[PDB]
Amino acid sequence: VVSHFNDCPDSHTQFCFHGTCRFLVQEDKPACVCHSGYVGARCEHADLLA
């Protein structure tokens, strides 16, 4: 509550190649979400990586 994000990019955004980027500023905490039709945690690979 109260805590919210806005400025996603803070270097930690480099942990996400192909996925939503959200950085909780008030609580500096990186958090990315995968898009779709992809694999991995960072979402660097697109299918063919089960």
Maximum CA extent, the chain: 41
Give the CATH number of domain 1-50; options: 2.10.25.10, 3.40.50.620, 3.20.20.80, 3.40.50.150.
Answer: 2.10.25.10
- The full set of domain ranges for the chain reads 1-50
CA distance 37 to 3: 31
Contact partners, residue 1, CB within 8 Å, separation at least 6? none
> What Cα–Cα distance (Å) separates residue 4 from each residue in 21, 23, 27, 33?
13, 9, 8, 16
How is 27-48 classified by DSSP, letter by letter? TTEEEEEE-SS-BSSS--B-SS
CA distance 48 to 22: 26
Contact partners, residue 9, CB within 8 Å, separation at least 6? 21, 23
> What Cα–Cα distance (Å) separates residue 6 from each residue in 25, 34, 38, 39, 48?
7, 18, 25, 26, 33
CA distance 23 to 11: 10
Experimental method: NMR
What the block records as the tokens of 26 is 């008030």
